[PDB]
Amino acid sequence: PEMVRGQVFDVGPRYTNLSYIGEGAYGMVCSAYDNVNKVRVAIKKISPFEHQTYCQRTLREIKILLRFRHENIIGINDIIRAPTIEQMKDVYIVQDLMETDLYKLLKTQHLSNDHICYFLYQILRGLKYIHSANVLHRDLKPSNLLLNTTCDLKICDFGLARVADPDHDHTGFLTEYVATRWYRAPEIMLNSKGYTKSIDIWSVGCILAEMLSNRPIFPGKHYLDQLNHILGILGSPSQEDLNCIINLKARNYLLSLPHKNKVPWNRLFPNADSKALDLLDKMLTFNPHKRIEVEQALAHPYLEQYYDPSDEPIAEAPFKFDMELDDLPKEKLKELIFEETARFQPGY
Numbered sequence: 001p002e003m004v005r006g007q008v009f010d011v012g013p014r015y016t017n018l019s020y021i022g023e024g025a026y027g028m029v030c031s032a033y034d035n036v037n038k039v040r041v042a043i044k045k046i047s048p049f050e051h052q053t054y055c056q057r058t059l060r061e062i063k064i065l066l067r068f069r070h071e072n073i074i075g076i077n078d079i080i081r082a083p084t085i086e087q088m089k090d091v092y093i094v095q096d097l098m099e100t101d102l103y104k105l106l107k108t109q110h111l112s113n114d115h116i117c118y119f120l121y122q123i124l125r126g127l128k129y130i131h132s133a134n135v136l137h138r139d140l141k142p143s144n145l146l147l148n149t150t151c152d153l154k155i156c157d158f159g160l161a162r163v164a165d166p167d168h169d170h171t172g173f174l175t176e177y178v179a180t181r182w183y184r185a186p187e188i189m190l191n192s193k194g195y196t197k198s199i200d201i202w203s204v205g206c207i208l209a210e211m212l213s214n215r216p217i218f219p220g221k222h223y224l225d226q227l228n229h230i231l232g233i234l235g236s237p238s239q240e241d242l243n244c245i246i247n248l249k250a251r252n253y254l255l256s257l258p259h260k261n262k263v264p265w266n267r268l269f270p271n272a273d274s275k276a277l278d279l280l281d282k283m284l285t286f287n288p289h290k291r292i293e294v295e296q297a298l299a300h301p302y303l304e305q306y307y308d309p310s311d312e313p314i315a316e317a318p319f320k321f322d323m324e325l326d327d328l329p330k331e332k333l334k335e336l337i338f339e340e341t342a343r344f345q346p347g348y
Ligand SMILES: Cc1cnc(Nc2ccc(F)cc2Cl)nc1-c1c[nH]c(C(=O)N[C@H](CO)c2cccc(Cl)c2)c1
Pocket: 021, 022, 023, 024, 025, 026, 027, 028, 029, 031, 042, 044, 045, 046, 074, 095, 096, 097, 098, 099, 100, 101, 104, 143, 144, 146, 156, 157, 159
Protein backbone atom coordinates (compact mmCIF):
# COMPACT_ATOMS: atom_id res chain seq x y z
CA PRO A 1 0.00 0.00 0.00
CA GLU A 2 1.30 3.45 -1.08
CA MET A 3 2.22 6.24 1.36
CA VAL A 4 2.34 10.03 0.92
CA ARG A 5 3.96 12.36 3.49
CA GLY A 6 3.42 9.80 6.25
CA GLN A 7 -0.14 8.87 5.31
CA VAL A 8 -0.79 5.36 4.00
CA PHE A 9 -3.34 5.43 1.09
CA ASP A 10 -4.77 1.96 0.86
CA VAL A 11 -6.52 2.51 -2.44
CA GLY A 12 -4.92 -0.02 -4.77
CA PRO A 13 -4.91 -1.82 -7.01
CA ARG A 14 -7.56 0.34 -8.76
CA TYR A 15 -5.89 3.64 -7.84
CA THR A 16 -2.12 4.01 -8.05
CA ASN A 17 0.73 6.54 -8.38
CA LEU A 18 -0.28 9.09 -5.79
CA SER A 19 0.93 12.65 -5.27
CA TYR A 20 0.09 15.04 -2.44
CA ILE A 21 -2.41 17.87 -2.97
CA GLY A 22 -3.38 19.13 0.42
CA GLU A 23 -4.64 18.39 3.86
CA GLY A 24 -7.33 18.96 6.35
CA ALA A 25 -8.09 18.64 10.01
CA TYR A 26 -8.40 14.82 9.90
CA GLY A 27 -6.95 13.82 6.54
CA MET A 28 -5.10 14.33 3.29
CA VAL A 29 -5.98 14.74 -0.41
CA CYS A 30 -3.82 13.25 -3.18
CA SER A 31 -4.04 12.87 -6.93
CA ALA A 32 -4.05 9.28 -8.23
CA TYR A 33 -4.28 7.32 -11.50
CA ASP A 34 -7.57 5.37 -11.87
CA ASN A 35 -6.67 2.13 -13.67
CA VAL A 36 -10.30 1.39 -14.56
CA ASN A 37 -11.29 4.74 -16.11
CA LYS A 38 -7.75 5.55 -17.38
CA VAL A 39 -7.78 9.03 -15.88
CA ARG A 40 -6.23 10.87 -12.91
CA VAL A 41 -8.55 11.60 -10.04
CA ALA A 42 -8.50 13.16 -6.57
CA ILE A 43 -8.65 11.02 -3.49
CA LYS A 44 -9.41 12.43 -0.12
CA LYS A 45 -8.44 10.24 2.82
CA ILE A 46 -10.28 11.04 6.04
CA SER A 47 -9.74 9.48 9.47
CA PRO A 48 -12.60 10.79 11.62
CA PHE A 49 -13.63 7.94 13.84
CA GLU A 50 -12.05 9.04 17.12
CA HIS A 51 -14.05 12.30 17.28
CA GLN A 52 -17.77 12.89 17.38
CA THR A 53 -17.49 16.23 15.55
CA TYR A 54 -15.36 14.83 12.73
CA CYS A 55 -17.78 11.90 12.27
CA GLN A 56 -20.75 14.34 12.06
CA ARG A 57 -18.94 16.44 9.44
CA THR A 58 -17.96 13.37 7.49
CA LEU A 59 -21.48 12.07 7.34
CA ARG A 60 -22.89 15.48 6.35
CA GLU A 61 -20.37 15.98 3.58
CA ILE A 62 -20.95 12.53 2.18
CA LYS A 63 -24.73 12.67 2.33
CA ILE A 64 -24.84 16.10 0.79
CA LEU A 65 -22.41 15.51 -2.02
CA LEU A 66 -23.91 12.14 -3.01
CA ARG A 67 -27.25 13.94 -3.38
CA PHE A 68 -26.00 17.02 -5.20
CA ARG A 69 -25.26 17.25 -8.88
CA HIS A 70 -24.04 20.51 -10.35
CA GLU A 71 -21.28 21.74 -12.65
CA ASN A 72 -19.91 24.16 -10.07
CA ILE A 73 -19.87 21.73 -7.13
CA ILE A 74 -17.45 18.87 -6.55
CA GLY A 75 -19.04 15.40 -6.55
CA ILE A 76 -18.11 11.97 -5.26
CA ASN A 77 -17.38 9.26 -7.83
CA ASP A 78 -16.34 6.42 -5.54
CA ILE A 79 -15.76 5.67 -1.88
CA ILE A 80 -13.27 3.14 -0.56
CA ARG A 81 -13.28 1.64 2.89
CA ALA A 82 -12.75 -1.69 4.58
CA PRO A 83 -15.21 -4.66 4.09
CA THR A 84 -16.16 -4.70 7.82
CA ILE A 85 -16.94 -1.94 10.30
CA GLU A 86 -14.17 -3.10 12.72
CA GLN A 87 -11.42 -2.87 10.08
CA MET A 88 -12.68 0.54 8.91
CA LYS A 89 -10.28 3.25 10.16
CA ASP A 90 -10.21 5.47 7.10
CA VAL A 91 -12.52 6.52 4.28
CA TYR A 92 -11.27 7.44 0.82
CA ILE A 93 -13.50 9.74 -1.23
CA VAL A 94 -12.71 9.76 -4.93
CA GLN A 95 -13.48 13.01 -6.81
CA ASP A 96 -12.82 14.71 -10.09
CA LEU A 97 -9.34 16.12 -10.19
CA MET A 98 -8.89 19.89 -10.57
CA GLU A 99 -5.61 21.76 -11.23
CA THR A 100 -5.38 24.40 -8.50
CA ASP A 101 -7.49 26.57 -6.19
CA LEU A 102 -8.17 30.28 -6.03
CA TYR A 103 -5.97 30.74 -2.93
CA LYS A 104 -2.94 29.53 -4.89
CA LEU A 105 -3.93 31.45 -8.03
CA LEU A 106 -4.16 34.71 -6.13
CA LYS A 107 -0.70 34.29 -4.74
CA THR A 108 0.74 34.54 -8.26
CA GLN A 109 -1.71 36.32 -10.49
CA HIS A 110 -3.69 39.58 -10.57
CA LEU A 111 -6.98 38.71 -12.25
CA SER A 112 -8.55 40.67 -15.08
CA ASN A 113 -12.03 42.12 -14.52
CA ASP A 114 -13.40 39.57 -16.96
CA HIS A 115 -11.90 36.68 -14.98
CA ILE A 116 -13.13 38.14 -11.72
CA CYS A 117 -16.64 38.45 -13.11
CA TYR A 118 -16.65 34.87 -14.51
CA PHE A 119 -15.32 33.37 -11.35
CA LEU A 120 -17.85 35.27 -9.23
CA TYR A 121 -20.61 34.11 -11.56
CA GLN A 122 -19.62 30.48 -11.08
CA ILE A 123 -19.35 30.79 -7.33
CA LEU A 124 -22.84 32.21 -7.18
CA ARG A 125 -24.23 29.75 -9.73
CA GLY A 126 -23.03 26.88 -7.52
CA LEU A 127 -24.22 28.65 -4.37
CA LYS A 128 -27.67 29.22 -5.96
CA TYR A 129 -27.95 25.45 -6.27
CA ILE A 130 -26.72 24.78 -2.73
CA HIS A 131 -29.10 27.38 -1.26
CA SER A 132 -31.99 26.09 -3.35
CA ALA A 133 -31.60 22.79 -1.47
CA ASN A 134 -31.73 24.83 1.80
CA VAL A 135 -28.12 23.82 2.39
CA LEU A 136 -25.39 26.15 3.68
CA HIS A 137 -21.71 25.64 2.77
CA ARG A 138 -20.36 27.59 5.77
CA ASP A 139 -16.68 27.65 4.84
CA LEU A 140 -16.45 29.43 1.52
CA LYS A 141 -12.96 30.83 0.95
CA PRO A 142 -10.42 30.85 -1.90
CA SER A 143 -8.82 27.50 -0.97
CA ASN A 144 -12.25 25.82 -1.29
CA LEU A 145 -12.74 27.04 -4.86
CA LEU A 146 -11.10 24.64 -7.31
CA LEU A 147 -10.02 25.72 -10.77
CA ASN A 148 -8.61 24.45 -14.01
CA THR A 149 -6.78 26.26 -16.81
CA THR A 150 -10.00 26.84 -18.69
CA CYS A 151 -11.34 28.74 -15.69
CA ASP A 152 -13.95 26.19 -14.70
CA LEU A 153 -14.66 26.54 -10.97
CA LYS A 154 -15.97 24.00 -8.45
CA ILE A 155 -16.81 24.56 -4.82
CA CYS A 156 -15.36 21.92 -2.53
CA ASP A 157 -15.11 20.91 1.18
CA PHE A 158 -18.61 20.47 2.55
CA GLY A 159 -17.40 19.41 5.97
CA LEU A 160 -19.11 22.37 7.68
CA ALA A 161 -22.23 22.25 5.52
CA ARG A 162 -25.63 21.88 7.02
CA VAL A 163 -29.31 22.38 6.40
CA ALA A 164 -30.37 25.97 7.11
CA ASP A 165 -32.02 26.47 10.50
CA PRO A 166 -32.98 30.16 11.05
CA ASP A 167 -34.97 29.31 14.15
CA HIS A 168 -31.84 28.11 15.93
CA ASP A 169 -29.43 30.69 14.57
CA HIS A 170 -29.36 32.70 17.80
CA THR A 171 -26.48 32.35 20.23
CA GLY A 172 -24.65 34.41 22.84
CA PHE A 173 -21.90 36.96 22.46
CA LEU A 174 -18.45 35.55 21.57
CA THR A 175 -19.67 32.04 20.79
CA GLU A 176 -16.91 29.68 19.40
CA TYR A 177 -16.98 29.18 15.67
CA VAL A 178 -15.18 26.64 13.49
CA ALA A 179 -15.20 28.17 10.00
CA THR A 180 -12.23 30.20 8.78
CA ARG A 181 -11.77 33.46 10.66
CA TRP A 182 -11.23 35.92 7.83
CA TYR A 183 -14.44 34.95 6.10
CA ARG A 184 -16.80 35.15 9.14
CA ALA A 185 -19.70 37.59 8.98
CA PRO A 186 -19.78 40.17 11.81
CA GLU A 187 -22.82 38.47 13.41
CA ILE A 188 -20.86 35.31 14.15
CA MET A 189 -19.05 37.24 16.90
CA LEU A 190 -22.26 38.88 18.16
CA ASN A 191 -25.30 36.61 18.02
CA SER A 192 -25.20 33.99 15.25
CA LYS A 193 -24.40 30.32 14.80
CA GLY A 194 -24.20 30.70 10.98
CA TYR A 195 -27.37 28.74 10.32
CA THR A 196 -28.76 31.09 7.61
CA LYS A 197 -27.98 31.66 3.98
CA SER A 198 -26.69 35.16 4.68
CA ILE A 199 -23.59 33.60 6.25
CA ASP A 200 -22.44 32.33 2.88
CA ILE A 201 -23.13 35.60 1.07
CA TRP A 202 -20.76 37.42 3.43
CA SER A 203 -18.01 34.90 2.66
CA VAL A 204 -18.56 35.40 -1.08
CA GLY A 205 -18.19 39.17 -0.59
CA CYS A 206 -14.88 38.57 1.14
CA ILE A 207 -13.77 36.38 -1.79
CA LEU A 208 -14.79 39.06 -4.30
CA ALA A 209 -12.68 41.62 -2.42
CA GLU A 210 -9.77 39.29 -2.56
CA MET A 211 -10.20 38.73 -6.34
CA LEU A 212 -10.20 42.52 -6.78
CA SER A 213 -7.12 43.19 -4.79
CA ASN A 214 -5.09 40.04 -3.91
CA ARG A 215 -5.46 40.99 -0.21
CA PRO A 216 -7.79 39.55 2.41
CA ILE A 217 -10.21 42.37 3.21
CA PHE A 218 -10.61 41.57 6.89
CA PRO A 219 -7.44 39.88 8.20
CA GLY A 220 -8.31 39.59 11.88
CA LYS A 221 -5.52 38.36 14.15
CA HIS A 222 -7.96 36.67 16.60
CA TYR A 223 -11.58 35.99 17.12
CA LEU A 224 -12.74 39.45 18.34
CA ASP A 225 -10.19 41.39 16.30
CA GLN A 226 -11.99 39.98 13.23
CA LEU A 227 -15.07 42.04 14.16
CA ASN A 228 -12.99 45.12 14.71
CA HIS A 229 -11.44 44.80 11.22
CA ILE A 230 -14.92 44.45 9.67
CA LEU A 231 -16.01 47.65 11.46
CA GLY A 232 -12.77 49.26 10.24
CA ILE A 233 -14.29 49.29 6.75
CA LEU A 234 -18.04 49.32 7.33
CA GLY A 235 -17.86 51.89 10.11
CA SER A 236 -19.95 51.88 13.26
CA PRO A 237 -23.29 50.16 12.79
CA SER A 238 -26.27 52.44 12.37
CA GLN A 239 -28.82 52.81 15.14
CA GLU A 240 -31.25 50.76 13.08
CA ASP A 241 -28.64 47.95 12.82
CA LEU A 242 -27.83 48.14 16.54
CA ASN A 243 -31.50 47.93 17.45
CA CYS A 244 -31.63 44.61 15.67
CA ILE A 245 -29.03 43.19 18.15
CA ILE A 246 -31.00 42.22 21.20
CA ASN A 247 -28.46 40.42 23.31
CA LEU A 248 -27.05 42.94 25.62
CA LYS A 249 -23.40 41.82 25.98
CA ALA A 250 -23.12 42.11 22.18
CA ARG A 251 -24.92 45.39 22.07
CA ASN A 252 -22.92 46.88 24.93
CA TYR A 253 -19.70 45.75 23.28
CA LEU A 254 -20.57 47.63 20.10
CA LEU A 255 -21.64 50.68 22.11
CA SER A 256 -18.23 50.64 23.92
CA LEU A 257 -16.19 51.05 20.71
CA PRO A 258 -15.00 54.37 19.42
CA HIS A 259 -16.91 55.67 16.52
CA LYS A 260 -15.49 54.40 13.15
CA ASN A 261 -16.00 55.96 9.75
CA LYS A 262 -17.17 54.00 6.74
CA VAL A 263 -14.22 53.72 4.37
CA PRO A 264 -15.31 54.12 0.73
CA TRP A 265 -14.89 51.01 -1.36
CA ASN A 266 -13.05 52.91 -4.09
CA ARG A 267 -10.19 53.68 -1.65
CA LEU A 268 -9.58 49.95 -1.26
CA PHE A 269 -10.28 49.14 -4.88
CA PRO A 270 -9.25 52.10 -6.99
CA ASN A 271 -9.15 50.15 -10.26
CA ALA A 272 -12.27 48.05 -9.80
CA ASP A 273 -15.39 48.08 -11.96
CA SER A 274 -17.90 50.36 -10.18
CA LYS A 275 -20.61 47.74 -10.63
CA ALA A 276 -18.46 45.14 -8.82
CA LEU A 277 -18.09 47.57 -5.93
CA ASP A 278 -21.86 48.11 -5.78
CA LEU A 279 -22.41 44.36 -5.56
CA LEU A 280 -19.59 44.03 -3.01
CA ASP A 281 -21.31 46.73 -0.86
CA LYS A 282 -24.55 44.67 -0.88
CA MET A 283 -22.78 41.40 0.00
CA LEU A 284 -20.83 43.04 2.82
CA THR A 285 -23.83 44.53 4.55
CA PHE A 286 -23.57 44.50 8.37
CA ASN A 287 -27.18 43.52 9.02
CA PRO A 288 -27.73 39.99 7.73
CA HIS A 289 -31.44 40.67 7.15
CA LYS A 290 -30.51 43.42 4.67
CA ARG A 291 -27.72 41.51 2.95
CA ILE A 292 -28.27 40.55 -0.71
CA GLU A 293 -29.55 37.01 -1.43
CA VAL A 294 -27.97 34.61 -3.95
CA GLU A 295 -30.50 35.12 -6.81
CA GLN A 296 -30.47 38.87 -6.27
CA ALA A 297 -26.66 38.87 -6.46
CA LEU A 298 -26.77 36.89 -9.72
CA ALA A 299 -29.29 39.44 -11.03
CA HIS A 300 -27.00 42.39 -10.23
CA PRO A 301 -25.72 44.56 -13.12
CA TYR A 302 -22.12 43.42 -12.58
CA LEU A 303 -23.13 39.88 -13.66
CA GLU A 304 -25.46 40.85 -16.55
CA GLN A 305 -23.27 39.22 -19.15
CA TYR A 306 -23.73 35.86 -17.47
CA TYR A 307 -26.95 35.72 -15.49
CA ASP A 308 -29.36 33.32 -17.17
CA PRO A 309 -31.84 31.39 -15.08
CA SER A 310 -32.44 29.01 -17.98
CA ASP A 311 -28.83 27.75 -17.51
CA GLU A 312 -28.65 27.71 -13.71
CA PRO A 313 -30.06 24.50 -12.26
CA ILE A 314 -31.67 24.26 -8.86
CA ALA A 315 -32.30 21.34 -6.54
CA GLU A 316 -35.48 19.27 -6.83
CA ALA A 317 -36.47 19.97 -3.21
CA PRO A 318 -34.91 20.84 0.15
CA PHE A 319 -32.18 18.49 1.38
CA LYS A 320 -33.33 16.67 4.50
CA PHE A 321 -31.31 14.67 7.08
CA ASP A 322 -33.30 11.63 8.27
CA MET A 323 -32.04 12.03 11.85
CA GLU A 324 -30.55 14.55 14.24
CA LEU A 325 -26.79 14.02 14.07
CA ASP A 326 -25.87 16.66 16.63
CA ASP A 327 -26.26 14.35 19.66
CA LEU A 328 -25.33 10.92 18.29
CA PRO A 329 -22.26 9.11 19.66
CA LYS A 330 -19.24 8.63 17.41
CA GLU A 331 -19.79 4.87 17.29
CA LYS A 332 -23.42 5.43 16.15
CA LEU A 333 -22.19 7.92 13.50
CA LYS A 334 -19.62 5.31 12.40
CA GLU A 335 -22.43 2.81 11.79
CA LEU A 336 -24.17 5.50 9.68
CA ILE A 337 -21.03 6.22 7.67
CA PHE A 338 -20.58 2.46 7.10
CA GLU A 339 -24.16 2.32 5.76
CA GLU A 340 -23.86 5.49 3.62
CA THR A 341 -20.72 4.12 1.91
CA ALA A 342 -22.06 0.54 1.41
CA ARG A 343 -23.32 1.07 -2.10
CA PHE A 344 -19.75 1.63 -3.37
CA GLN A 345 -18.62 -1.77 -2.11
CA PRO A 346 -17.90 -4.62 -4.57
CA GLY A 347 -21.16 -6.64 -4.79
CA TYR A 348 -23.95 -4.54 -3.24
C1 LIG B 1 -11.29 17.37 -4.62
C2 LIG B 1 -10.07 18.02 -5.22
C3 LIG B 1 -9.75 17.90 -6.56
N1 LIG B 1 -8.73 18.47 -7.18
C4 LIG B 1 -7.95 19.26 -6.41
N2 LIG B 1 -6.80 19.72 -6.89
C5 LIG B 1 -5.86 20.64 -6.41
C6 LIG B 1 -6.21 21.67 -5.53
C7 LIG B 1 -5.27 22.55 -5.05
C8 LIG B 1 -3.97 22.40 -5.45
F1 LIG B 1 -3.01 23.18 -4.87
C9 LIG B 1 -3.58 21.45 -6.35
C10 LIG B 1 -4.54 20.58 -6.84
CL1 LIG B 1 -4.02 19.30 -7.91
N3 LIG B 1 -8.10 19.45 -5.11
C11 LIG B 1 -9.14 18.86 -4.50
C12 LIG B 1 -9.35 19.26 -3.11
C13 LIG B 1 -8.79 20.36 -2.48
N4 LIG B 1 -9.23 20.44 -1.22
C14 LIG B 1 -10.04 19.36 -0.98
C15 LIG B 1 -10.64 19.19 0.34
O1 LIG B 1 -11.70 18.61 0.48
N5 LIG B 1 -9.99 19.79 1.41
C16 LIG B 1 -10.44 19.73 2.79
C17 LIG B 1 -9.90 20.95 3.52
O2 LIG B 1 -10.40 22.15 2.91
C18 LIG B 1 -9.95 18.48 3.51
C19 LIG B 1 -8.88 17.75 3.01
C20 LIG B 1 -8.47 16.59 3.66
C21 LIG B 1 -9.10 16.16 4.81
C22 LIG B 1 -10.13 16.93 5.32
CL2 LIG B 1 -10.80 16.55 6.85
C23 LIG B 1 -10.57 18.07 4.67
C24 LIG B 1 -10.16 18.69 -2.17
